[PDB]
Amino acid sequence: AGLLLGHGPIRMVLAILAFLRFTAIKPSLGLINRWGSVGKKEAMEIIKKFKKDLAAMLRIINARKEKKRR
């Protein structure tokens, strides 16, 4: 259970990395050591889908306060 042990696949590695990027100033060297172990092809896919989730995230944040329609 990657979510439970905090050690998922390379996809979760980048997730934890971004976590430690916006929650911290210095990511843990364990993630950094496994960082270069991420297949850059998968990384390309991850980053693509990541930006897509962020784009949706942004959109929904806007819709959360609905840009004050009312």
Added chain:
Amino acid sequence: AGLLLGHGPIRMVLAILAFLRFTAIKPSLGLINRWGSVGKKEAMEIIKKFKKDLAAMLRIINARKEKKRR
């Protein structure tokens, strides 16, 4: 200490959200409840810088295995 208590500002909220997006299938409702509390202006800024960090991340992953120069 937002990093220690796992409760930083709205910037860290989105960070934890993305974490729970790529590490989990269902984010915790606490984050979801504070999600709409994120200033969508700040969100725009966060998401922008987030994609920038991801772009750099990708680039460095490529440079980690250096696309097999050698």
